Design a protein around this ligand. Structure first.
Ligand SMILES: [Ca+2]
Length: 223
């Protein structure tokens, strides 16, 4: 996260870290046994880390649970990042408490102008490189589809939305990938892509979760 703030330990209780010997992407806990992330975060050998603040210090509220199964969206296209969404099943259920909690799925899609909360452990610099140990947060608005398509001509599908600031300075970044965009108490996006981080006229592009609720519900009901 570029241009954000330190969240506070466990104030984002649905945030997870995906670890494959190192933190590599974020995710969102949607019930005691399932995590939502980005399909471009796919790898074999994922351990899910819940209740994290400092990802380099065991502080005592963590739960570390291996993945039993990964499910990339059937229509995921890695060239265009269309349908950039994956489900991860945990080997055992998490214990939900004040520090580890699930986030609701949306019933309707979020509105342009809504201020959302984006979080993660990704790079904090534009170019240059500095990775935080503690979770970072950013408030950012949903942009109009018109402005999104103007920023990224020929590249935005109906399964993507833009959030952030056309002036630059504040954005998600590499290592935030897979993490949540929460708007009005629901998971409305997944950190997906963008041109650089926090560059003028190049806002963040997010997977539009409201288009995937049927797929999520049917997949959880069968696995
Ligand atoms: Ca920790």
């Amino acid at each position: 996260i570029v241009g954000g703030y330190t969240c506070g330990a466990n104030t984002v209780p649905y945030q997870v870290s995906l670890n494959s010997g190192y933190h590599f992407c974020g995710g969102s806990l949607i019930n005691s046994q399932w995590v939502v992330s980005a399909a471009h975060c796919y790898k074999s050998g994922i351990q899910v880390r819940l209740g994290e603040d400092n990802i380099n210090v065991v502080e005592g509220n963590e739960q570390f649970i291996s993945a039993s199964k990964s499910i990339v969206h059937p229509s995921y296209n890695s060239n265009t990042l269309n349908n950039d969404i994956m489900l991860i099943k945990l080997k055992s259920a998490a214990s939900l408490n004040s520090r580890v909690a699930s986030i609701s799925l949306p019933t309707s899609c979020a509105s342009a102008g809504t201020q959302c909360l984006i979080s993660g452990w990704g790079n904090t610099k534009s170019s240059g490189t500095s990775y935080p140990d503690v979770l970072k947060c950013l408030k950012a608005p949903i942009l109009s589809d018109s402005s999104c398509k103007s920023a990224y001509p020929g590249q935005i599908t109906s399964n993507m939305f833009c959030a952030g600031y056309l002036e630059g300075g504040k954005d998600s970044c590499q290592g935030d990938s897979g993490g949540p965009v929460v708007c009005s108490g629901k998971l409305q996006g997944i950190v997906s892509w963008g041109s650089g981080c926090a560059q003028k006229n190049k806002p963040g592009v997010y997977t539009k979760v409201c288009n995937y609720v049927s797929w999520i519900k049917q997949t959880i009901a069968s696995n």
